[PDB]
Amino acid sequence: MDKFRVQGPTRLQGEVTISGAKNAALPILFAALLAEEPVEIQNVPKLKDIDTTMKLLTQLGTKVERXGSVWIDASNVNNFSAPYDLVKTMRASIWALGPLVARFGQGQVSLPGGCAIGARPVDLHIFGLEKLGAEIKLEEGYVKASVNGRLKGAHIVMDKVSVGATVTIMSAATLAEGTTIIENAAREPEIVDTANFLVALGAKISGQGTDRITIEGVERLGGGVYRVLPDRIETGTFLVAAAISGGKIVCRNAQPDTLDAVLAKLREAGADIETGEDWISLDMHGKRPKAVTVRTAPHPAFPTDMQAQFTLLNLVAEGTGVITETIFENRFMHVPELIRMGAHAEIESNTVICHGVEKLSGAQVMATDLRASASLVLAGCIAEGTTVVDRIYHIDRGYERIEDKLRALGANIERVKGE
Numbered sequence: 001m002d003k004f005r006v007q008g009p010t011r012l013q014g015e016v017t018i019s020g021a022k023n024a025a026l027p028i029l030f031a032a033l034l035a036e037e038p039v040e041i042q043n044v045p046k047l048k049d050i051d052t053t054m055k056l057l058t059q060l061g062t063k064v065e066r067x068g069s070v071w072i073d074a075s076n077v078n079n080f081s082a083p084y085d086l087v088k089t090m091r092a093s094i095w096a097l098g099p100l101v102a103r104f105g106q107g108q109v110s111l112p113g114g115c116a117i118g119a120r121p122v123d124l125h126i127f128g129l130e131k132l133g134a135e136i137k138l139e140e141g142y143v144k145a146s147v148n149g150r151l152k153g154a155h156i157v158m159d160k161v162s163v164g165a166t167v168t169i170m171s172a173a174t175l176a177e178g179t180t181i182i183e184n185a186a187r188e189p190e191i192v193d194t195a196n197f198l199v200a201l202g203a204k205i206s207g208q209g210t211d212r213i214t215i216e217g218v219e220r221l222g223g224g225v226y227r228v229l230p231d232r233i234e235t236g237t238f239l240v241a242a243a244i245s246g247g248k249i250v251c252r253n254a255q256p257d258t259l260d261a262v263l264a265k266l267r268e269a270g271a272d273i274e275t276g277e278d279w280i281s282l283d284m285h286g287k288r289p290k291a292v293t294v295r296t297a298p299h300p301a302f303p304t305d306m307q308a309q310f311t312l313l314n315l316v317a318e319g320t321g322v323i324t325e326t327i328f329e330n331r332f333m334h335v336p337e338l339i340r341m342g343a344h345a346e347i348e349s350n351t352v353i354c355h356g357v358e359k360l361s362g363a364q365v366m367a368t369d370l371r372a373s374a375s376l377v378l379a380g381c382i383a384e385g386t387t388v389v390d391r392i393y394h395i396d397r398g399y400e401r402i403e404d405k406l407r408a409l410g411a412n413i414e415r416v417k418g419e
């Protein structure tokens, strides 16, 4: 089992090229199940989650190839289930459900079990499907959906803002008979990306990116070529890496408009930020960051996927920073890990109260969250001495070669395989 050996402190300086969004590539890959003709998805990151998704697709009888692009041919889907072993390593597996039932009239996906960051049921996905006319049963731990003929469009109001349920419903609706309206839809840039992918295939969708999505179902979806938007979380993570190290960086292949909240908070922390059409520059001018107050919420508010990263920022900032989590109430495992490194903070309910320190100290820490745990690697970059991050497979699931990108920024980091 891999581990990172990080030697700090290091001032991060240089350039990084942002990879395609893991969170757009995922739902788009699942949506490709709908395509009758070959599809080429461009700008797909090379990460563990994509590997798992590829595996799942192949298990359905989908032909899959990859490099920068992932080539999909779902003309011969011959299997309709996502097994326990796979779903257990990737909750996003639930996304296979909707396309399968919508196109083939059947689909079975192992029901996701417990999650360390909090309660993450998929009740809304199921509800949505049912609303579309799907019959759903639970057998041997498998959620089994079925419909005789086409799904039927319906007016659905979401009890919660859900990225996942919005994708499930929107995707399945493209093949339903009639019009589907998703009210209180998630507005994430990844939702707009997936919708656009769908439309490129022949789907009829409007309102994507707003709280109200309207889908007019069609008979079949063709094929095509589609480029995945830049990864906003990867971008934010690198921006924070520079901001907490007194550094200077330029992010290439970026989409500034997906980052307003994060950029604004970085400015509050004291960063000098410039943006262009496809780039973002950040210069700390060698300054320590200033503590900020953050509240995670659905896009375009501050994203929960940047929360750990900002907690780190606050932990080495001047002042008392406060971070409140409204999406994943228990998403605080990074905190005690950071405290092992000398940080100071208290967790009261869904809020962490940070007491910024001048310097962190290297220590042994454990990764557990595919997006948040990158925080540990960042901490090692600025801590005094050696930090060893265990279980880095978690990071591998959500980031493409993060050590390589960090290394090009000046980081002293080594992938240690010897156990």
Ligand SMILES: CC(=O)N[C@H]1[C@@H](OP(=O)(O)OP(=O)(O)OC[C@H]2O[C@@H](n3ccc(=O)[nH]c3=O)[C@H](O)[C@@H]2O)O[C@H](CO)[C@@H](O)[C@@H]1O
Pocket (backbone or CB within 6 Å): 023, 026, 092, 119, 120, 121, 122, 123, 124, 125, 126, 160, 161, 162, 163, 164, 165, 186, 303, 304, 305, 327, 328, 371
């Ligand atoms: C593969 C992917 O894109 N994952 C992202 C997506 O996940 P994910 O799609 O799971 O997140 P949702 O937006 O669906 O979850 C938001 C909240 O609603 C709850 N909920 C959701 C669905 C449901 O059926 N019932 C229910 O109660 C969840 O438990 C959570 O408290 O958005 C999260 C919030 O931006 C990100 O942190 C994840 O990295």
